[PDB]
Amino acid sequence: QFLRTDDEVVLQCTATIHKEQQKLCLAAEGFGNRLCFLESTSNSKNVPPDLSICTFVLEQSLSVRALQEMLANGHRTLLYGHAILLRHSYSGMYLCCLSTSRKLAFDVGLQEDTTGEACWWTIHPASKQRSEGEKVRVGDDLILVSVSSERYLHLSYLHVDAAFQQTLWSVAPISSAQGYLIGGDVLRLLHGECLTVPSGEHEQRRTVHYEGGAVSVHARSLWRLETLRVAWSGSHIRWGQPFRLRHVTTGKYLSLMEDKSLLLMDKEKADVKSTAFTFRSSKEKLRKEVDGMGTSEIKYGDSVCFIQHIGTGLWLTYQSSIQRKAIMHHEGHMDDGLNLSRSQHEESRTARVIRSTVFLFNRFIRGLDALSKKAKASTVDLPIESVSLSLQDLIGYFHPPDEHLEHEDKQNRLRALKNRQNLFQEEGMINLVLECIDRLHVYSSVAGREAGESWKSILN
């Protein structure tokens, strides 16, 4: 009903492109982009909106004079006339204005720090039905005003920017109980053994195996649940509510065409009943939607979740590498109300890095493959600055800790370093980078060389 600090919300409009409610939600990228863009929510039945790069945390809601006083150096409820510290839920960065242009307008994006008036956002409602100083609730559209630039959060044409004109902004809650299935969570799947997807050098990894061993702990066994319910998508999971399913590691979607097989496909193939899956307590064919965070229905380690597609009514079981291929059977065995275990935060964080890692380098490799032609002279599709920006971030992401750290903290930073090296090993991303060393060892400085001017420093 109400909005406090540490809530999970999104920002959305429907940009009217020739009488079309273009349902665009705000999405910064992070770890490879300091800029922001939009994600379509219009064709959510067939084109799945991403969510994890779109949610936000209201870290604080202070007044004006208190913020200016603290700038000289509980769960507080939202009030119109307060400056808030918005924070990207995935990247951990804070939403701020940027000093670039895409007019005296300004760009928006994330940043590392939190000081300065860039990351601060005072709120004003553009509706006479409510007024200043009172509480902000669900469905309260507003104008969000910058503090540094003193501009409004402008939506342009498609430019999310900071200009001297205003645009309304819908706010929809996502979430607000430990040991329970929460929407958007990343989780393992206990089988004996666990559900797994095959390793790299691909198949295009599109098959499905059941396996125990070290790859249960390791990268490929990661699953982020997503519902079709756009608002309140971080609510507590109950039985029979609809799920899509995106694979975390490969960046694909677990789709089902019972005509062919269990499919591992992209966004646009993942339609409604291509992948509408649910969970049941028994294996029989016996709510629908709640405007809240709901009740905690399913536990983690003590749970019997029977997977079933809505569109075909089948029940997933193994067949008879350990290749017990999970196929949507009509009945299956009694080993299909499986058990769960969630993963942790930096585990999910690196996993979300990896599928954003490969989509740069594959455009970097094929960008070089287009320049591997004797005469192409038109392949502009070759990232440079997005490579270098993501490169220092990954350099920073594996930065060893200093000697000016307490030893208990330094182990945890070291233990964070070890696991994050281990996931890149059993993804074999070194070999992905190793191919970029091949395709950049051609010249001594290249191409039309003005864009490729940092060809020395990129290689170092």
Binding site: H407, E408, Q411, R415
Partner: protein, 84 residues
């Protein structure tokens, strides 16, 4: 100083534990440091000696080295429990 040695070695994961006869020595040295009024004075004399350890961080060092060695029932662990 000495208890700050072992706790840091307890936190540096070696994915198993070693013998460390230095630790096996000083564990048993500390563990060897532990009709009404003649009895009740001994409860104070014990609680003086128990206070001398567990403010110097000697509490969680026996808690740590148990958590480090997972399933090994070696003599390393048995010298902790006799201090525990």
């Amino acid at each position: 100083q000495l208890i700050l040695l072992f706790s840091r070695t307890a936190l540096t994961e070696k994915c198993k534990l070693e013998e460390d006869f230095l630790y096996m020595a000083y564990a048993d040295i500390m563990a060897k440091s532990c009709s009404f009024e003649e009895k009740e004075m001994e409860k104070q004399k014990l609680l003086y000696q128990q206070a001398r350890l567990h403010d110097r961080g000697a509490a969680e060092m026996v808690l740590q080295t148990i958590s480090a060695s997972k399933g090994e029932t070696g003599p390393m662990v048995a010298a902790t429990l006799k201090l525990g």
